[PDB]
């Protein structure tokens, strides 16, 4: 539920008036692979 959590908290800074990077197909993935 990482993608759902990031999308849910992703909308709050729009309500609170802060800039948010626009979403695409890189959100809920391991950006940097582990060891």
């Amino acid at each position: 539920s990482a993608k759902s959590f990031i999308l849910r908290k992703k909308e709050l800074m729009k309500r609170r008036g802060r800039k948010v990077a626009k979403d695409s197909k890189f959100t809920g993935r391991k950006r940097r692979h582990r060891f």
Binding site: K14, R15, R16, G17
Partner: protein, 217 residues
């Protein structure tokens, strides 16, 4: 195409007043925004916050937009503008209007000896708004402003050069810190020093002597 609508508007329309120190000297109440635009140019603006707030009714959910903006030209004159309106352009516009209505002058000074074009604040000063205390401490030459980027932007728009900025409380709320900084810089203008101990002439409020072309039509 602004027309004079009040006594101060008729005062500034003929150009018989040339400084804002007369307004800030005898505690002149400011009524409109056009006086400071027609009297001082170069008032640069920068939006600080735009947020969607809500009001819940019986049937609908009316969403307002709240605009928080700052105003200051380049030197010692800071205004804060808070507004809730219906559209983003209207909220920004009315926030700039109330920002011009809330302009306060600032007395800067020297951290050390009295040489070379004052840079910093004269006194240790504080301000508070809702469990956020913003403190301002004079700093030496070349120290710069060490503060949060919102407070740093506000103080750079102020025209002050070196400020040490300690803060306390839950500082993550942007509005509380901004209002604390605003009341702090108002406090450091309002502070009384021995340099203000010389006997001023105490003028006779020249609105009395200029009332015969500043009255009603």
């Amino acid at each position: 195409g602004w027309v004079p609508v009040t006594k101060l508007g008729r005062l500034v329309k003929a150009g018989k007043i040339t400084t804002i120190e007369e307004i800030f000297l005898h505690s002149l109440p400011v009524k409109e925004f056009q006086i400071i635009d027609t009297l001082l140019p170069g008032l640069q603006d920068e939006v600080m916050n735009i947020k969607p707030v809500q009001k819940q009714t019986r049937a609908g959910q009316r969403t307002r937009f709240k605009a928080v903006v700052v105003v200051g030209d380049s030197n010692g004159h800071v205004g804060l503008g808070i507004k809730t309106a219906k559209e983003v352009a209207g909220a920004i516009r009315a926030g700039i209007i109330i920002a011009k209505l809330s302009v306060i002058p600032i007395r800067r000074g020297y951290w050390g000896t009295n040489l070379g074009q004052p840079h910093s604040l004269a006194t240790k000063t504080t301000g508070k708004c809702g469990s956020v205390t913003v403190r301002l401490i004079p700093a030496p030459r070349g120290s710069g402003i060490v503060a949060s980027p919102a407070v740093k932007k506000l103080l750079q728009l102020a025209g002050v050069e070196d400020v040490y900025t300690q803060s306390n409380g839950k500082t993550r709320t942007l509005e509380n810190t901004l209002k604390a900084a605003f009341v702090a810089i108002g406090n450091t203008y309002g502070f009384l020093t021995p340099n203000l101990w010389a006997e001023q002439p105490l003028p006779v409020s020249p609105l009395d002597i200029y009332s015969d072309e500043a009255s009603a039509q």
